[PDB]
Design a protein around this motif. Structure first.
Motif, PDB file in Angstrom:
ATOM      1  N   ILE A 173       0.832  -1.206   0.000  1.00  0.00           N
ATOM      2  CA  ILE A 173       0.000   0.000   0.000  1.00  0.00           C
ATOM      3  C   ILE A 173       0.865   1.255   0.000  1.00  0.00           C
ATOM      4  O   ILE A 173       0.488   2.272  -0.589  1.00  0.00           O
ATOM      5  N   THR A 207       3.821   1.652  -1.482  1.00  0.00           N
ATOM      6  CA  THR A 207       4.210   1.838  -2.876  1.00  0.00           C
ATOM      7  C   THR A 207       3.026   2.292  -3.716  1.00  0.00           C
ATOM      8  O   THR A 207       3.164   3.185  -4.556  1.00  0.00           O
ATOM      9  N   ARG A 208       1.846   1.704  -3.489  1.00  0.00           N
ATOM     10  CA  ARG A 208       0.668   2.080  -4.265  1.00  0.00           C
ATOM     11  C   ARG A 208       0.349   3.563  -4.107  1.00  0.00           C
ATOM     12  O   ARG A 208       0.230   4.293  -5.095  1.00  0.00           O
ATOM     13  N   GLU A 209       0.238   4.028  -2.862  1.00  0.00           N
ATOM     14  CA  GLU A 209      -0.157   5.411  -2.626  1.00  0.00           C
ATOM     15  C   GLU A 209       0.931   6.381  -3.069  1.00  0.00           C
ATOM     16  O   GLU A 209       0.634   7.454  -3.610  1.00  0.00           O
ATOM     17  N   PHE A 210       2.197   6.024  -2.858  1.00  0.00           N
ATOM     18  CA  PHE A 210       3.257   6.968  -3.180  1.00  0.00           C
ATOM     19  C   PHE A 210       3.479   7.045  -4.687  1.00  0.00           C
ATOM     20  O   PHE A 210       3.753   8.128  -5.215  1.00  0.00           O
ATOM     21  N   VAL A 211       3.322   5.923  -5.405  1.00  0.00           N
ATOM     22  CA  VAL A 211       3.314   5.942  -6.864  1.00  0.00           C
ATOM     23  C   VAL A 211       2.089   6.686  -7.389  1.00  0.00           C
ATOM     24  O   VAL A 211       2.159   7.347  -8.428  1.00  0.00           O
ATOM     25  N   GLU A 212       0.950   6.587  -6.698  1.00  0.00           N
ATOM     26  CA  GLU A 212      -0.211   7.387  -7.083  1.00  0.00           C
ATOM     27  C   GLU A 212       0.084   8.876  -6.964  1.00  0.00           C
ATOM     28  O   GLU A 212      -0.289   9.662  -7.843  1.00  0.00           O
ATOM     29  N   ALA A 213       0.745   9.279  -5.880  1.00  0.00           N
ATOM     30  CA  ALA A 213       1.155  10.674  -5.735  1.00  0.00           C
ATOM     31  C   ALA A 213       2.147  11.072  -6.821  1.00  0.00           C
ATOM     32  O   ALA A 213       2.099  12.192  -7.344  1.00  0.00           O
ATOM     33  N   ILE A 214       3.062  10.164  -7.169  1.00  0.00           N
ATOM     34  CA  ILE A 214       4.022  10.422  -8.239  1.00  0.00           C
ATOM     35  C   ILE A 214       3.298  10.656  -9.560  1.00  0.00           C
ATOM     36  O   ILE A 214       3.616  11.584 -10.314  1.00  0.00           O
ATOM     37  N   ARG A 215       2.311   9.810  -9.862  1.00  0.00           N
ATOM     38  CA  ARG A 215       1.552   9.951 -11.101  1.00  0.00           C
ATOM     39  C   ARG A 215       0.721  11.227 -11.098  1.00  0.00           C
ATOM     40  O   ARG A 215       0.566  11.872 -12.139  1.00  0.00           O
ATOM     41  N   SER A 265       1.598  14.003  -9.564  1.00  0.00           N
ATOM     42  CA  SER A 265       2.571  15.059  -9.826  1.00  0.00           C
ATOM     43  C   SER A 265       2.954  15.108 -11.300  1.00  0.00           C
ATOM     44  O   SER A 265       3.086  16.191 -11.877  1.00  0.00           O
TER      45      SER A 265
END
Lengths: 101, 146, 81
Positions: B93, B95-103, B105
């Motif tokens: 989770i 990685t999921r949320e932080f990659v979601e924030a990356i996307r 951005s």
């Protein structure tokens, strides 16, 4: 960047120091204490050391899976707060230069 | 191309060997704890306990020596990752949320780039329109920017 | 006034407009831990910590200068008592 070899060496040194301290404490502990308590404490220490070595195992497995995602992740983060810093610098420049208006 | 593949294969083999050795160490520690819990006090059990302790010490020393080899391919773990992995779960989770924030951005970056591009295109067009005499530098401005 | 033909600014590399994931062939790991598969369905159940990476090993993880020979002999004497 922190080298994995240095982390492993530090963990091994800490484990050796903890084991030496436990052995010394058992040495100068009075014999009146039952051996069951000492055995339980030794088992708990062994369990803690095994847990630390299993954390190192998980790190080793992650490095085996490894950096590509990490590199992209770090680059995108750098771009993000660089943009945020540029926005903040623009706001600060306008706040400063409003006086000269 | 072949050198990178060879280096990757060597690194994978070394990491697999390290994983196997650490798994063996963990199994030996589990056996040591089981023997300690169910220790009968017989001299044979005591000798087995001593042998297991010596084997564990030798395995730990070998792991420390091999993992500290400067020529080994082993030579980042942020503290936030260590904090997140202390919650008894399967690590997805974060990685999921932080990659979601990356996307998010990245999408913001792309949208703002498109917006700025249309901004300066329209501004150049109108500056050419009402100010033809400044038309020539404006295109150069594009050449200075693009 | 400030129009200098000698001053040329190059494109920033890498270009954020392009697919930065595929610039260096970095799609394998992203696909491995992608939020959803190509059909949009959930691939694996998601959680937080490293606990499930040790479930295969035996155990019940419910809650998550030096003389070795002398220490071994001391432990043996203590256990035999």
């Amino acid at each position: 960047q922190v080298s994995l070899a240095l982390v492993i060496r530090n963990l091994t040194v800490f484990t050796m120091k903890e084991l030496a301290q436990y052995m010394k404490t058992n040495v100068h502990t009075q014999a009146n204490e039952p051996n069951s308590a000492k055995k339980i404490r030794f088992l708990q220490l062994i369990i803690f050391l095994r847990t630390q070595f299993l954390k190192l195992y998980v790190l080793v497995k992650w490095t085996r899976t490894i950096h590509v995602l990490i590199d992209l992740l770090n680059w995108f983060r750098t771009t993000n707060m660089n943009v945020n810093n540029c926005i903040w610098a623009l706001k600060s420049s306008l706040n400063s230069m409003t006086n000269a208006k | 191309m072949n050198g990178n593949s060879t280096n990757n294969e060597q690194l994978q083999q070394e990491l697999a060997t390290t994983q196997d050795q650490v798994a063996s160490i963990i199994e030996s520690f589990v056996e040591l704890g089981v023997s300690i819990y169910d220790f009968p006090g017989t001299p044979e059990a005591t000798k087995g306990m001593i042998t297991n302790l010596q084997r564990n010490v030798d395995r730990l020393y070998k792991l420390n020596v091999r993992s500290n080899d400067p020529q080994s391919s082993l030579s980042d773990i942020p503290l936030e990752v260590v904090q997140y992995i202390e919650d008894g779960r399967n690590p997805d989770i974060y990685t999921r949320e932080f990659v979601e924030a990356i996307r998010r951005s990245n999408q913001y970056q792309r949208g703002k780039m498109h917006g700025l591009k249309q901004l300066r295109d329209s501004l150049a067009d109108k500056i050419v329109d009402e100010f033809p005499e400044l038309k020539e530098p404006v295109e150069d401005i594009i050449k200075r920017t693009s | 006034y400030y129009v200098d033909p000698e001053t040329t600014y190059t494109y920033q590399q890498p270009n954020p407009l392009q697919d930065l994931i595929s610039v260096y062939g970095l799609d394998d790991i992203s696909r491995q831990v992608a939020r959803t598969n190509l059909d949009g369905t959930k691939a694996v159940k998601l959680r937080k910590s490293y606990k499930n990476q040790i479930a295969d090993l035996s155990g019940k993880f419910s809650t998550i200068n030096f003389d070795w020979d002398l220490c071994s002999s001391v432990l043996s004497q203590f256990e035999r008592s």
